[PDB]
From Swiss-Prot, chain A:
Assembly and oligomerization: Component of the Mediator complex, which is composed of at least 21 subunits that form three structurally distinct submodules. The Mediator head module contains MED6, MED8, MED11, SRB4/MED17, SRB5/MED18, ROX3/MED19, SRB2/MED20 and SRB6/MED22, the middle module contains MED1, MED4, NUT1/MED5, MED7, CSE2/MED9, NUT2/MED10, SRB7/MED21 and SOH1/MED31, and the tail module contains MED2, PGD1/MED3, RGR1/MED14, GAL11/MED15 and SIN4/MED16. The head and the middle modules interact directly with RNA polymerase II, whereas the elongated tail module interacts with gene-specific regulatory proteins.
Family, similarity comment: Belongs to the Mediator complex subunit 17 family.
Subcellular location: Nucleus
Record-given protein name: Mediator of RNA polymerase II transcription subunit 17
Lineage: Eukaryota, Fungi, Dikarya, Ascomycota, Saccharomycotina
Note: Present with 1720 molecules/cell in log phase SD medium.
Organism: Saccharomyces cerevisiae (strain ATCC 204508 / S288c)
Domain of life (superkingdom): Eukaryota
UniProtKB/Swiss-Prot annotation, chain B:
Subunit structure: Component of the Mediator complex, which is composed of at least 21 subunits that form three structurally distinct submodules. The Mediator head module contains MED6, MED8, MED11, SRB4/MED17, SRB5/MED18, ROX3/MED19, SRB2/MED20 and SRB6/MED22, the middle module contains MED1, MED4, NUT1/MED5, MED7, CSE2/MED9, NUT2/MED10, SRB7/MED21 and SOH1/MED31, and the tail module contains MED2, PGD1/MED3, RGR1/MED14, GAL11/MED15 and SIN4/MED16. The head and the middle modules interact directly with RNA polymerase II, whereas the elongated tail module interacts with gene-specific regulatory proteins.
Signal peptide: none
Compartment annotation: Nucleus
Name recorded for this polypeptide: Mediator of RNA polymerase II transcription subunit 14
Domain of life: Eukaryota
Family of this protein: Belongs to the Mediator complex subunit 14 family.
Organism name: Saccharomyces cerevisiae (strain ATCC 204508 / S288c) (Baker's yeast)
Note, other: Present with 319 molecules/cell in log phase SD medium.
Swiss-Prot record, chain E:
Domain of life (superkingdom): Eukaryota
PTM-bearing positions, type N-acetylserine: 1
Name used for this protein in its record: Mediator of RNA polymerase II transcription subunit 22
Keyword entries, A-Z: Acetylation, Activator, Nucleus, Transcription, Transcription regulation
Gene name per UniProt: SRB6
InterPro entries listed in its UniProt record: Med22 (IPR009332), Med22_Saccharomyce (IPR016530)
Species assigned in the record: Saccharomyces cerevisiae (strain ATCC 204508 / S288c)
KW NADP (keyword) present: no
Swiss-Prot record, chain F:
The UniProt record lists the keyword Cytoplasm: no
BP-aspect Gene Ontology terms: negative regulation of transcription by RNA polymerase II; positive regulation of transcription by RNA polymerase II; positive regulation of transcription elongation by RNA polymerase II; positive regulation of transcription initiation by RNA polymerase II; RNA polymerase II preinitiation complex assembly
Organism: Saccharomyces cerevisiae (strain ATCC 204508 / S288c)
GO molecular function list: TFIIH-class transcription factor complex binding; transcription coactivator activity
The name this protein goes by in its record: Mediator of RNA polymerase II transcription subunit 11
Keyword terms: Activator, Coiled coil, Nucleus, Transcription, Transcription regulation
Disulfide bonds: none
Name of the encoding gene: MED11
Main location: nucleus
Effect of residue 63 to P: Impairs interaction with SRB4/MED17, SRB6/MED22 and RAD3
Note: Present with 396 molecules/cell in log phase SD medium.
InterPro entries for the chain: Mediator_Med11
Gene3D superfamilies: 1.10.287.3490
């Protein structure tokens, strides 16, 4: 909003509450039931000082408003909204909580740095959204900005896609290790990463670094024999940060028995079945 | 999901919801809110003595449990395991739930299966046995298609086509037919990693 | 396309003051741009009856093709090592995708507030064949090169589709480049409209711009004869 | 006290 | 808008000084009581003139009032440390 | 700053008005002393009135010159962001990764 400056000097907004949000990281132990607090972001406390403080209040409250407009579309992906100033994120191994409280309510913790980095990534992603509004105002629209929640949603979901993509890559490497590494001797897996307006362009690209989609192609190095040379190359991608898409690219080099099978499965059991069909015929005798 | 109404010259106020039902009326001398249920109906008293937020918040839960109770007697499949209390959905156990603000089905980690699964709920709010059997049809056809070839032009989705001429049925068993340019020939045959060997024997 | 424009003119001294004023009003810095426009007139060697097949009079009009070109072909040797912004203006096989346009005479009406003009436009993507040059294409359609002018200036992006073009215009010839806007900058304020309510609303936007800029720079309405590209 | 006054106006009506 | 401050301010100065001289020339010469209240009213008009000068000077004061590598590496270590891959 | 030094000069003009009030109480009070029947407070009287009109004249010269500055400052040094937040998050992030 806009406050009125009067007389030392003081700034009276619309004394006042200190709305500073925080993120805490929970962890599920061997009980496989509830979660425990494993991390929490630290909270730090004449005229320009109140300017920066109130700008942080309106900024973080605006980001919280974007999160409230985000859980309504992330409701089907586990991210449930409960309290008007408290949302929860459910994971099969962990759990997140985003609260907007003051300093009146509520160390051996370990995930204290991951929460800080997560919040800094929240504010940075919001700045990226602002740059997408300015860039989405200077060139094309020739008037006002046109945004879509689902399209401008990206804050919490792309962050969840990193952990979920890490778990999907772990289970995928487990399936590959059990169906290839535990079958053939010499084998290894190697991952490989897939005018005067230049100021804004530079900014955008650095967050090109933050804004990428987690997609990794796992090349399978099969032991090439003197009579057979099979080729197996998987590619794990995601259609929208979350979800898992396993694209199996198989190129058989066996003499008098060469065929290319490039399939796409989203179920790990189907990956075990297809890889079983590959290793039980083309790879082995 | 919320529509308000305020009536004058009769002294009554109405609140309507479940727009994707529950009547507030004053016809004696007190405001009452009678909430309907599937083959049932109960009453909630209204004035400060009763929070509108708590009553309207719990009614959707109590009737929501009955909505979850209809699915057990509507049309549940054998392989499709469902549990109302925290809708356990086993095709892989997937967390199913019903949206409170709308009434559609939500699954944990969606897929194409859950886009077509959710399209039936998006239309009508149980012919989903049919859609389920169609999906279970689709998967096997994807495997047999990637292994073999599949061509759709003259046959119906009730039985796949392989290409003389070949065909394979799912409801009845390998069948050998020939087509004109109208079926001309028809013979039946009974058959049994094993699927790979079977496909290698088919040729 | 119905373009509603209001023009103006400033000097070489108030350029920074107008850039600062429009920067404080629009809230955005200016964007440097340029464009080359070539005008093709009917071939004088060819003679055709100015009449359609339906026995209707036809008025000959010129065809203007415009495109873009980076500043690497515009900056010479004495212009190197300078900021690429609005302060530069004070120091003054196939074919490219051309922009074919034909402008008509503005509408009549005394005491008019805006200058509405009908302009037809088609996009020339590319070409091929023997005579693949755009000049040979215009000669095939029945037009020859008359003149051309290259304009370099700055533009703003406000609201409701308003454009403020503060540009200079030069005539590209072989004997030399003569500056038409020698002594100042040409100002423009046009909106491109594809309804009566939207036209009157655009006129309301232009009148609000002239009222907001009243006192500083005056935005009058140009003469119709000054925007008529018909051949006589 | 004005909204209650209008409340009584629409009440007696 | 400054010419109104020229004419107005200068008029307040001329009324202040000239009215002060008229004051002192009327303090030195029911007529006596009318002199009492004429002198007192001249004094109060001088006070209102000084206050007017203060208001006008206050209006004058109100007129005076009215890179990419560090981000790629920083976010790289931030994501790698965040997910603990 | 410009408006800071000029604002201090305006405050100096206001203190010159206060001095004008001192010389006003002095011309009226010492004038009343002259009208009681005393003539020995005459030189300090004339000096206080001369300082009255002198301080007033200096207020006119400095004030009118100030208004001339207002007229000659229009357009020049007088009117007729997420970047700092991004850099703040970058410096804070670097402070997290490097304590």
């Amino acid at each position: 909003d806009r406050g009125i400056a009067n007389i030392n000097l003081d700034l009276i907004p619309h004394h006042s509450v200190k709305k500073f949000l925080r993120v805490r990281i929970f962890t599920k132990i061997e009980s496989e039931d509830d979660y425990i607090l494993s991390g929490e972001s630290v909270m730090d406390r004449d005229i320009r000082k109140q300017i920066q403080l109130l700008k942080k209040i309106i900024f973080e409250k605006e980001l919280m408003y974007q999160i409230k407009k985000e859980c309504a579309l992330l409701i089907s992906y586990g991210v449930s909204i409960e309290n008007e100033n408290k949302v929860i994120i459910e994971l099969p191994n962990e759990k997140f909580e985003i609260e907007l409280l003051s300093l009146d309510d509520d160390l051996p913790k370990i995930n204290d740095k991951r929460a800080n980095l997560m919040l800094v990534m929240l504010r940075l992603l919001l700045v990226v959204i602002f740059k997408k509004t300015l860039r989405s105002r200077i060139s094309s629209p020739h008037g006002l900005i046109n945004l879509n929640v689902d399209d401008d949603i990206l804050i919490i979901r792309p962050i969840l896609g990193k952990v979920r993509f890490a778990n999907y890559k772990l289970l995928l490497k487990k399936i590959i290790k059990d169906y290839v590494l535990d079958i053939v001797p010499g084998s290894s897996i190697t991952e490989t990463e897939v005018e005067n307006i230049t100021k804004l362009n530079k900014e955008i690209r650095a967050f090109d670094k933050l804004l990428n989609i987690p997609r990794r192609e796992l090349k399978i190095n099969l032991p090439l024999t003197e009579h057979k040379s099979p080729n197996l190359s998987l590619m794990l991608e995601s259609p929208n940060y979350c979800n898992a898409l396993i694209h199996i690219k198989f190129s058989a080099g066996t003499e008098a028995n060469a065929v290319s099978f490039d399939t796409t499965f989203s179920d790990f059991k189907e990956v075990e079945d297809f890889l079983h069909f590959i290793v039980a015929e083309y790879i082995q005798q | 999901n919320l529509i308000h109404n305020y009536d004058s010259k009769k002294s009554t106020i109405t609140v309507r919801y479940w727009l994707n039902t529950i009547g507030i009326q004053r016809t004696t001398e007190s405001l009452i809110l009678k909430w309907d249920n599937q083959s049932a109906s109960r009453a909630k008293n209204m004035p400060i003595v009763s929070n509108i937020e708590g009553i309207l918040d719990e009614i959707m839960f109590n009737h929501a449990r009955i909505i979850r109770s209809e699915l057990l007697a509507r049309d549940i499949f054998q392989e499709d395991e469902e549990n109302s209390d925290v809708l356990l959905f086993q095709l892989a156990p997937i967390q199913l739930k019903i949206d409170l603000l709308s009434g559609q089905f939500y699954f944990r980690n969606p897929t194409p299966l859950l886009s077509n699964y959710a399209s039936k709920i998006n239309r009508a709010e149980e012919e989903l046995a049919r859609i389920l059997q169609q999906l279970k049809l689709d998967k096997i056809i994807h495997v047999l298609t990637t292994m073999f070839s599949r061509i759709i032009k003259i046959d119906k989705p009730i039985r796949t086509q392989v290409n003389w001429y070949l065909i394979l049925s799912i409801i009845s068993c390998v069948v050998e037919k020939r087509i004109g340019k109208r079926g001309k020939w028809n013979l039946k045959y009974l058959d049994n990693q094993k699927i790979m060997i079977l496909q290698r024997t088919i040729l | 396309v119905q373009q509603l424009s209001l023009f103006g003119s400033i000097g070489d001294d108030g350029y920074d003051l107008l850039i600062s004023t429009l920067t404080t009003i629009s809230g955005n810095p200016p964007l440097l741009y340029n464009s080359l426009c070539t005008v093709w007139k009917p071939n004088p060697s060819y003679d055709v009856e100015n009449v359609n097949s339906r026995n209707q009079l036809v008025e000959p009009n010129r065809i203007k093709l415009s495109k873009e070109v980076p500043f690497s072909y515009l900056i010479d040797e004495t212009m190197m090592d300078k900021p690429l912004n609005f302060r530069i203006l004070k120091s003054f096989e196939s074919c490219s995708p051309w922009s074919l346009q034909i402008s008509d005479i503005p509408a009549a009406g005394n005491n008019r507030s805006v200058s509405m003009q009908t302009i037809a436009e088609t996009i020339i993507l590319s070409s091929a064949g023997k005579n693949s040059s755009v000049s040979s294409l215009m000669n095939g359609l029945g037009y020859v090169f008359e003149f051309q002018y290259l304009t370099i200036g700055v533009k703003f992006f406000m609201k409701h589709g308003l454009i403020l073009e503060l540009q200079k215009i030069w005539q590209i010839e072989e004997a030399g480049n003569s500056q038409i806007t020698s002594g100042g900058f040409l100002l423009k304020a046009y909106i491109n409209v594809s309804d009566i309510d939207r036209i009157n609303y655009t006129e309301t936007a232009l009148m609000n711009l002239k009222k907001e800029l009243q006192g500083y720079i005056e935005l009058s309405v140009p003469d119709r004869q000054s925007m008529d590209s018909r051949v006589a | 006290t004005e909204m209650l006054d209008k409340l009584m106006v629409t009440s007696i009506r | 808008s400054n010419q109104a401050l020229y004419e107005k301010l200068e008029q307040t100065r001329t009324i202040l000084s000239v009215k002060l001289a008229e004051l002192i020339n009327m303090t030195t010469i029911a007529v006596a009581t009318t002199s009492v209240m004429m002198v007192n009213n001249q004094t109060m008009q001088l006070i209102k003139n000084v206050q007017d000068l203060l208001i006008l000077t206050r209006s004058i004061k109100e007129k005076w009032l009215l890179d990419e590598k560090q981000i790629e590496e920083l976010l790289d270590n931030c994501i790698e440390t965040f997910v603990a891959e | 700053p410009y408006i800071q030094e000029r604002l201090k000069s305006l405050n100096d003009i206001e203190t010159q008005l206060c001095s004008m009030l001192q010389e006003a109480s002095q011309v009226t009070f010492i004038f009343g002393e002259l009208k009681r029947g005393n003539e020995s407070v005459k030189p300090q009287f004339e000096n206080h009135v001369k300082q009255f009109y002198e301080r007033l004249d200096k207020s006119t010269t400095q004030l009118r010159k100030e208004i001339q500055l207002l007229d000659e400052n229009v357009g020049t040094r007088l009117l007729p962001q997420d970047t700092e937040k991004m850099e703040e998050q970058l410096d804070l992030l670097s402070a997290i990764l490097d304590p």
